[PDB]
């Protein structure tokens, strides 16, 4: 149910709830800890915007849709859907699962290449280091337990104007050689 | 103007008693206590339609709310349990309309009780040097961070260049890696970026240090076992530039 997409492209979140309501809301999760208010959409609303922001809502088969448009690294976040029903008094606001969207740039001037780094204190451990490749490629999980790799990371280099992605992989074994993990 | 909840981290043995703070200058009526697991989905456990009002939530757990003042919600946990281990998030609302409703929430506290403290595991930190085939055929240098082994969960790495923190070039991954996926108490491991200009990092007289914050044993907490106590600790590692 994750979604990554590439930065100014679109993103349609949607959403099912049980009993009905009288008040849908969406919000974002940051870093997996603290949650904000996104939108807001009445009982008797079909569509609302808030800028980039666009929901839509029908009570006839109990679902909902959030349309981010021209996306930012920033929105990448965890989007949460939140129903609202009451008896007047109370105001039971529940929370759905939950959608994982990671939003990446594009890359200027790919240049894919892995090297091996070693460490600064007198030791023979080492990491590799897959970088600078563009952002239409796979970072393969290792099908070796002693292997480890990471998911993909994008650095901001501001003052060059330039961005670039990276993965490590290290592992515990004697004599590893960078030149195949990672290989797809 | 914000909802603070503390502390940040917990990590404690069962049979310990635990009070998580809440607080708000906003001056709103109503407070919420939801529970998070790591399966992904939010749980109603307590809420406060203000001073004098507590209320039993969607899922029941064995824990107790306090609202003396309209700005503190503390949640009291009498007795901790492994089945306590979760994400405990603080929220507010008003009651006038105009953008109306829509919760505030705090940026919560994770805890993690253990049942067994031997568990428990504070990280080594390494540095690795950039690559000088990178920096011949890229002109920039890449600093790679590593910290392995610990356990619980709960760090928070940085960057120190010439004694400031730094934001700029850096990556960090989103979350730890399990060291043995299979492992219910399995140690974790955690990686960071950090990129430079080549004569940046080939300036002998810069200093470079990776920094990872643990979360861990309390002063007190009892520890009979011979390594030292894994107390919530900073392990570092640095490295100087090569003059090349």
């Known amino acids: 149910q994750a979604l990554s997409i590439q930065e100014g492209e679109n993103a349609t979140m949607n959403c099912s709830y049980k009993?009905?309501?009288?008040?849908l809301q969406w919000y974002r999760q940051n870093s997996g800890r603290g949650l904000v208010h996104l939108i807001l959409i009445r009982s008797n609303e079909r569509e609302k915007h808030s800028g980039r922001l666009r929901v839509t809502l029908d009570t006839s088969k109990k679902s909902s849709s959030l349309l981010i448009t021209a996306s930012r690294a920033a929105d990448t976040a965890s989007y949460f859907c939140a129903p609202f029903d009451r008896g007047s008094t109370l105001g039971r606001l529940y929370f759905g699962r939950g959608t994982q969207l990671t939003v990446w740039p594009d890359i200027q001037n790919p240049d894919p290449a892995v090297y091996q780094l070693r460490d600064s204190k007198s030791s023979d451990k080492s990491v590799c280091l897959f970088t600078d490749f563009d952002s239409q490629t796979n970072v393969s999980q290792s099908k070796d337990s002693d292997v480890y790799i990471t998911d993909k990371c994008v650095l901001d280099m501001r003052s060059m104007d330039f961005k670039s992605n990276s993965a490590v992989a290290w592992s515990n074994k004697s004599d590893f050689a960078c030149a195949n993990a990672f290989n797809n | 103007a914000d909802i603070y909840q503390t502390p940040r981290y917990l990590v404690i043995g069962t049979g310990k008693k635990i009070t998580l703070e809440c607080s708000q200058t906003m001056g709103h009526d109503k407070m919420y206590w939801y529970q998070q697991d790591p399966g992904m989905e939010l749980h109603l456990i307590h809420y406060?339609?203000?001073?004098?009002?507590?209320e039993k939530g969607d899922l029941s757990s064995e824990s107790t709310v306090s609202r003396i003042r309209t700005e503190h919600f503390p949640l009291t946990l009498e007795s901790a349990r492994p089945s306590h281990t979760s994400q405990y998030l603080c929220?507010?609302?008003?009651?006038?309309?105009?953008?109306?409703?829509?919760?505030?929430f705090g940026s919560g506290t994770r805890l993690t009780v253990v049942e067994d403290l031997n568990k428990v595991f504070p990280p080594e930190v390494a540095v690795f040097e950039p690559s000088e085939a990178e920096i011949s055929h890229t002109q920039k240098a890449t600093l790679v961070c590593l910290a392995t082994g610990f356990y619980p969960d709960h760090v928070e790495l940085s960057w120190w260049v010439n004694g400031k923190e730094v934001h700029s070039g850096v990556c960090t991954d989103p979350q730890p890696l399990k060291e043995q996926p299979a492992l219910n108490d399995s140690r974790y491991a955690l990686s960071s970026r950090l990129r430079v200009s080549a004569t940046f990092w080939q300036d002998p007289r810069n200093h470079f240090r990776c920094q990872v914050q643990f979360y861990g044993l309390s002063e007190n907490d009892e520890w009979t076992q011979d390594r030292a106590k894994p107390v919530t600790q900073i392990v570092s590692a640095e490295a100087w530039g090569r003059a090349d």
């Open positions: 929220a507010s609302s008003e009651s006038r309309t105009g953008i109306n409703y829509g919760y505030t």
């Open positions: 009993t009905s309501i009288n008040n």
């Open positions: 406060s339609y203000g001073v004098n009002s507590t």
